[PDB]
């Protein structure tokens with residue numbers, strides 16, 4: 001079955017607003033979210049519904065853009081790099097579970113390319 005989704009709130013962690021964090025939500029995440037190939041990445045992989053029973057045997061650090069969006073909205077991240085790492089994990093997981101030429105892999109490649117173009121103009125710390 002599925003694990004619970006990743007935590008999107010931490011009550012023992014302080015919160016701050018930064019130029020970088022605002023950009024990550026309003027520019028980076030927003031732009032990826034609206035991409036034609038965003039849909040497989042907008043929520044946790046539902047392995048039960050999709051009948052992918054080995055998915056969470058193979059992927060022990062799942063991540064998705066729905067989670068990332070909620071983390072940003074909830075001020076879950078203190079440092080911008082925490083958010084960037086989550087995107088990286090999300091992409092890397094595809095390359096672990098799937099094979100070259102799989103639809104999902106081509107979709108990940110397009111999103112990652114876009115992600116890098118957007119992170120390029122990330123405001124300074």
Ligand SMILES: CCc1c(C(=O)Nc2cc(S(=O)(=O)N(CC)CC)ccc2O)[nH]c(C)c1C(=O)CO
Nearest residue numbers: 039040041043045046049050093094095097098104
């Ligand atoms: C191909 C499986 C997969 C998805 C995915 O989500 N595929 C998906 C979702 C649904 S759906 O019913 O849940 N659905 C309604 C359309 C989405 C809102 C239906 C069919 C699907 O192929 N994502 C990732 C990262 C993977 C990986 O294999 C990654 O290693």
